Paper text:
Inorganic pyrophosphatase (PPase) catalyses the hydrolysis reaction of inorganic pyrophosphate (PPi) to two inorganic phosphates (Pi) and plays an essential role for living organisms. We previously reported the expression and purification of family II PPase from the psychrophilic Shewanella sp. Sh-PPase activated by Mn2+ ions (Mn-Sh-PPase) displayed the highest activity at 5 °C, which is characteristic of cold-adapted enzymes. X-ray crystallography and EPR spectroscopy were used to investigate a cold-adapted family II Sh-PPase from a psychrophilic bacterium that lives in the Southern Ocean.
The crystal structure of Mn-Sh-PPase in the absence of substrate was determined at 2.2 Å resolution. The M1 site in Mn-Sh-PPase was coordinated with one nitrogen of histidine, two oxygens of aspartates (D12 and D72), and a bridged water. Additionally, the M1 site was bound with an extra water molecule. Coordination geometry of the M2 site in Mn-Sh-PPase was also similar with that of Bs-PPase and Sg-PPase with 5-coordinated bipyramidal geometry. However, the distances of a bridged water in the Sh-PPase from M1 and M2 (3.0 and 2.4 Å, respectively) were considerably longer compared with crystal structures of other di-Mn enzymes. In addition to the Mn-O distance, the Mn-Mn distance of Sh-PPase was also longer than arginase and catalase. Our observations reveal that the di-Mn centre of Mn-Sh-PPase in both single crystal and solution forms has longer distance with bridged water.
Residue numbers in the entry: 2 to 307
């Protein structure tokens, strides 16, 4: 069988996409097993529970196996031993990264806000009906990725596809299911600082400099008030533990549609150079900022070249 698998530190898109593409492949006689490279966030765990699904199989070694990649095309986000596997498919909505194959494959890549939007196109192409349970987690993955359409990564294709999936899943109020997800993401009390920093954390090599960026998306930025000092202490620790130039944590308020960024950097004027807004006691408010890959990373990469 093939293993359908998303990126290291799986998000809803990577997990819901794996289940959604595995089902499709099994229905068209191309045997497939959903898999993951890490634990589910409470967000993803809630989505699976609500629509009645088991987590994909936890699997880290793929040497000698067939692999269908979801929601990236990067070596670093792939399984450690991806070079010893055979990539038979990629479905994604990112820039084309450094993954390569020695064998013919499928690529379904589109400039949209969510892999699950593309996977919906795959069902239509194959003329396989989307079961109500699958439609719902597919829906939720797109609301997760596009932040209920508020993220500037949201495209026309994502909106029309959610509207389509909502009817198939018999969800009347897709926006209420979206807010239900971000409420679960907003329940941060009692969670160790490190679990929160690493929930959605990525390392970047920006012109020789190692820059780590976490992000939490919540309904109200006030939930972080009592734990914020523990966060600032833990991003200092983590900067040392990895010998990082910079560790930044995005606290993203999806109602104000902005991000408070906690900063520890070897560069004192980092946020002044990249965004034209300086940090004040290792903190800066970034109005309108929702997306790491669109509004945060480009401007940092530009400042490490300059
Ligand atoms: Ca390539
Ligand atoms: Mn993702
Ligand atoms: Mn995605």
């Amino acid at each position: 069988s093939m293993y359908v698998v998303g990126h290291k530190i799986p998000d809803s898109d990577s997990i819901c996409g794996a289940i959604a593409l595995a089902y499709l492949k099994n229905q068209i006689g191309e045997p497939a097993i959903a898999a993951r490279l890490g634990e589910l966030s409470p967000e993803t765990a809630f989505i699976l529970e609500k629509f009645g699904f088991e987590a994909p199989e936890y699997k880290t070694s793929y040497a000698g196996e067939e692999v269908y990649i979801v929601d990236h095309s990067e070596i670093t986000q792939a399984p450690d031993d991806i070079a010893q596997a055979t990539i038979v498919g990629i479905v994604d909505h990112h820039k084309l990264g450094d993954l390569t194959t020695s064998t013919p494959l499928e690529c379904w890549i589109r400039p949209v806000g969510c892999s699950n939007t593309v996977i919906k196109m795959m069902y239509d192409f194959y003329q396989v009906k989307i079961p109500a349970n699958i439609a719902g987690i597919m829906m939720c993955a797109i609301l997760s990725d596009t932040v209920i359409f508020k993220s500037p990564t949201c495209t026309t294709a994502d909106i029309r596809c959610v509207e389509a999936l909502a009817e198939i899943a018999g969800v009347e109020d897709f926006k209420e299911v979206g807010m239900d997800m971000f409420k679960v993401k907003s329940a941060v009390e009692g969670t160790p600082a490190r679990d929160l920093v690493m929930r959605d954390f990525k390392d970047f090599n920006m012109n020789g400099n190692l820059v780590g960026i976490g992000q939490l998306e919540v309904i109200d930025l006030a939930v972080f008030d009592d734990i914020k000092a523990d966060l600032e202490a833990d991003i200092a620790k983590l900067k040392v533990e990895g010998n990082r130039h910079s560790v930044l944590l995005l606290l993203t308020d999806i109602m104000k549609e902005g991000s408070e960024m906690l900063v520890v950097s070897d560069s004192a004027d980092l946020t002044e150079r990249a965004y034209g807004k300086p940090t004040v006691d290792g903190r800066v408010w970034l109005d309108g900022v929702l997306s790491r890959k669109k509004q945060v990373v480009p401007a940092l990469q530009d400042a490490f070249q300059k």
